[PDB]
Amino acid sequence: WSSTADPLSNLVLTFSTKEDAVAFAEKNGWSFDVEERKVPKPKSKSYGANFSWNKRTRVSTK
Amino acid sequence: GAGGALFVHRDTPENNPDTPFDFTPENYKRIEAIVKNYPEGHKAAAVLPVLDLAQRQNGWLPISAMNKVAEILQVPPMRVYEVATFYTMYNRKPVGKYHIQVCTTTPCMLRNSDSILEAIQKKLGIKVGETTPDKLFTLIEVECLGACVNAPMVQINDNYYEDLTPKDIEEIIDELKAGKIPKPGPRSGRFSCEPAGGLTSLTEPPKGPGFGVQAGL
Amino acid sequence: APKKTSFGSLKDEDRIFTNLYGRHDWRLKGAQSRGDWYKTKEILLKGPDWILGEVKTSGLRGRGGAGFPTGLKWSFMNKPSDGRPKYLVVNADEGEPGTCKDREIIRHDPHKLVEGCLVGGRAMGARAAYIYIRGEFYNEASNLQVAIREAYEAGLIGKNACGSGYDFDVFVVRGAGAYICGEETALIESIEGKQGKPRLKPPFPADVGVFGCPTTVANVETVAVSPTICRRGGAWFASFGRERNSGTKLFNISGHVNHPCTVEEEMSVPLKELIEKHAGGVIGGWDNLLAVIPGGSSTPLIPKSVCETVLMDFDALVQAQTGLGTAAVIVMDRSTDIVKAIARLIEFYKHESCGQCTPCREGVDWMNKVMARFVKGDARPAEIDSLWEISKQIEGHTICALGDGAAWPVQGLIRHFRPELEERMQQFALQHQ
Ligand SMILES: NC(=O)C1=CN([C@@H]2O[C@H](COP(=O)(O)OP(=O)(O)OC[C@H]3O[C@@H](n4cnc5c(N)ncnc54)[C@H](O)[C@@H]3O)[C@@H](O)[C@H]2O)C=CC1
Ligand SMILES: Cc1cc2nc3c(=O)[nH]c(=O)nc-3n(C[C@H](O)[C@H](O)[C@H](O)COP(=O)(O)O)c2cc1C
Numbered sequence A: 001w002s003s004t005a006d007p008l009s010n011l012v013l014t015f016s017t018k019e020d021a022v023a024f025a026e027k028n029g030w031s032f033d034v035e036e037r038k039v040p041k042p043k044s045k046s047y048g049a050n051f052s053w054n055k056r057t058r059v060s061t062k
Numbered sequence B: 001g002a003g004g005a006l007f008v009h010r011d012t013p014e015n016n017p018d019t020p021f022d023f024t025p026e027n028y029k030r031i032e033a034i035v036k037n038y039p040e041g042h043k044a045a046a047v048l049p050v051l052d053l054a055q056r057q058n059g060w061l062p063i064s065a066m067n068k069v070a071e072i073l074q075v076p077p078m079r080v081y082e083v084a085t086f087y088t089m090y091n092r093k094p095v096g097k098y099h100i101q102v103c104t105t106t107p108c109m110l111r112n113s114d115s116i117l118e119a120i121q122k123k124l125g126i127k128v129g130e131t132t133p134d135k136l137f138t139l140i141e142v143e144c145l146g147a148c149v150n151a152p153m154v155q156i157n158d159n160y161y162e163d164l165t166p167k168d169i170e171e172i173i174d175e176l177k178a179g180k181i182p183k184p185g186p187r188s189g190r191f192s193c194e195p196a197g198g199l200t201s202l203t204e205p206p207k208g209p210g211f212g213v214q215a216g217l
Numbered sequence C: 001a002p003k004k005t006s007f008g009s010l011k012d013e014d015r016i017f018t019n020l021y022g023r024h025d026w027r028l029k030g031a032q033s034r035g036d037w038y039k040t041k042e043i044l045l046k047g048p049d050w051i052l053g054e055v056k057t058s059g060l061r062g063r064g065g066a067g068f069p070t071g072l073k074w075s076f077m078n079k080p081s082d083g084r085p086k087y088l089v090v091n092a093d094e095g096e097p098g099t100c101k102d103r104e105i106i107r108h109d110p111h112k113l114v115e116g117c118l119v120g121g122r123a124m125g126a127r128a129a130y131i132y133i134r135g136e137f138y139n140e141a142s143n144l145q146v147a148i149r150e151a152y153e154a155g156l157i158g159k160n161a162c163g164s165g166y167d168f169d170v171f172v173v174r175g176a177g178a179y180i181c182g183e184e185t186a187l188i189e190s191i192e193g194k195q196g197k198p199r200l201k202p203p204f205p206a207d208v209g210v211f212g213c214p215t216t217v218a219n220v221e222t223v224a225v226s227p228t229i230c231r232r233g234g235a236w237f238a239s240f241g242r243e244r245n246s247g248t249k250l251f252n253i254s255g256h257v258n259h260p261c262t263v264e265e266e267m268s269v270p271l272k273e274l275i276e277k278h279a280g281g282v283i284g285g286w287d288n289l290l291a292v293i294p295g296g297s298s299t300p301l302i303p304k305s306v307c308e309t310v311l312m313d314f315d316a317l318v319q320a321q322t323g324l325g326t327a328a329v330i331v332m333d334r335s336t337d338i339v340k341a342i343a344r345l346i347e348f349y350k351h352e353s354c355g356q357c358t359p360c361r362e363g364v365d366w367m368n369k370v371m372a373r374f375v376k377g378d379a380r381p382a383e384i385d386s387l388w389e390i391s392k393q394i395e396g397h398t399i400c401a402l403g404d405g406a407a408w409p410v411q412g413l414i415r416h417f418r419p420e421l422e423e424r425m426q427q428f429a430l431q432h433q
């Protein structure tokens, strides 16, 4: 079986914002690394572009 | 019923990429005429005719013919495969000299297409998906060939034989197996979709040009 | 007395397709002797706006089955160009069971279709016309090609068409055995060398169509009456039929009638009048009639009690919980297994589905299995309501109207012949103990 010796291997906390998590980590004395939130960028979707007269976006199959 | 045909190709000595296929020079001129019917930069629109032309030269479509069409039209072979497996008129297995197609849809069924089908089966000694041992006839069932008024009807090699009785189709098969050319059309003594009762309309002589023209034109 | 209240008894002088039966020469000389290609130059010189106005006044609705107003639909191409060519596509697929009207137009009156292509393309500012015909119509397509060659040699189409200074080409493309390719976007995809799978709308074809260009898809019968409409005027066409149901119509009467036939008749003619006058009546008398499918396989059937007074127009048949469709009247007498005929239609739709979208691809096959069991009576009565719900799930949730056309006949059968289904199930449960 898989054995461990650190008691915090299953500790995961949930926070509403990054600032709340940072404050909680700071008051508990834990050194922290913060990674910024990644949001997918908005994209331009056009169904008609599938059938373009002169562009490469024309599809060869459906 | 569920289609007994398969939509995956497995290479066979009778059907593989090394199977010899090539268009004849006359067919290459025909392909040139076909391709010139579409705008520049849209060559793939010629996939359906050119593929069909290959069948008209070969009788059926071995995978080498599909690859040849794809090479000629600069089209990926998978697109040609999609076209060949989507449309039912393409023969991906060899068929007999005379491909008999019997419409069994409801308007033709109401006019006893079953009798025609059983007459064909008995006259040829095969079933609705088989080929005769002499490779002269193949029989299948098709959907609504578009002559429901002339039901029941049968298509043989892009010819229509309509207003059929079992004796009519047996005579047609007898004429076909003797090498003759049976005349397409109805067999009831009626030329076309007209009423058999005596032409209930269009009895008067057709009017001339400009008879109903409005003013100012 | 204006505002005709009885419709029918159409005269030969008012009929449009005068060579319906091919008793006269279908070549160019015979068509010209019958009134075709007469003053086409003056029609083209009147301008697109005048032609579109004539079509709008005519009240012509789409003869392909949906009945969309033709003038409004053709007006969508009256926009200025944006650098792309413009195209007219003529729909000659004719896949609907019980419908053979287009075939007769192509084989016996091809010059009417060609002149209609020219006039409609001028109205829509279209450079050329592509005629898509089903591949089974090989001889019809060859006759059409011969007529097109005759028009090219006579200068009627091509460069400087009819001397009007407008260049127009007519191309014939043949399909290969696919009923779905009669759907306009599936037809456009088929022309471009792809599988005949319909496109989602929007964009509509007038924005993005064949080769990505502005395109109008129009039924052959719709195209072939436009030159006559322009010549005789919109008003003449308008007088026939009820209001908003104008003009004449080609009817194909098949099934259990004495003389199955294709005829031309006024729009709002009663169904009984049509059947008893032109088709010779129902086999075994009118009292032998069991059911009628009035507008091709996609329209729901109506029992005898409804067929006695119903009129053959869009609005009346809509009120009768059915449709005018292609005006293909399939008659079934009392000797018909009504469940088996509808099961055969469902099997047709199962074999014609393109398979692109989930509701059609799965539910049409599911309904086919359920109907095959219903024919034997293997099921339970509760499943009937289940089947109804399945149809409702399929209807309105599919990319194209093939799902509608598969759901509607089942709904008609359940609406009018539920006792037959329950009675068959009772027999099956009895005999199998
Ligand atoms: N002639 C034949 O052999 C067959 C005929 N049909 C008939 O086709 C009918 C349904 O076909 P659909 O095309 O799906 O009906 P639809 O109502 O969606 O379209 C009818 C025509 O009007 C146009 N249109 C409709 N709404 C539009 C809008 N908001 N803007 C611009 N254009 C618009 C469409 O582009 C189309 O050309 C069925 O009722 C059936 O009877 C079906 C199969 C075969
Ligand atoms: C499954 C399906 C098949 C169709 N087949 C045909 C056909 O064979 N011929 C036709 O004219 N219209 C057919 N239509 C209707 C066309 O999509 C389109 O509405 C019509 O061609 C428009 O022409 P119109 O406005 O002149 O009627 C079909 C529609 C569907 C959903």
Ligand code: SF4
Residues within 6 Å of the ligand: C180, C197, C198, C352, C353, C354, C355, C356, C357, C358, C360, C361, C398, C399, C400, C401, C402, C403
């Ligand atoms: S409804 Fe049927 S035919 Fe139409 S797109 Fe969907 S799967 Fe294809």
Ligand code: FES
Residues within 6 Å of the ligand: B103, B104, B105, B106, B107, B108, B109, B143, B144, B145, B146, B147, B148, B151, B153, C096, C097, C098, C099
């Ligand atoms: S039902 Fe047989 S041709 Fe249409």
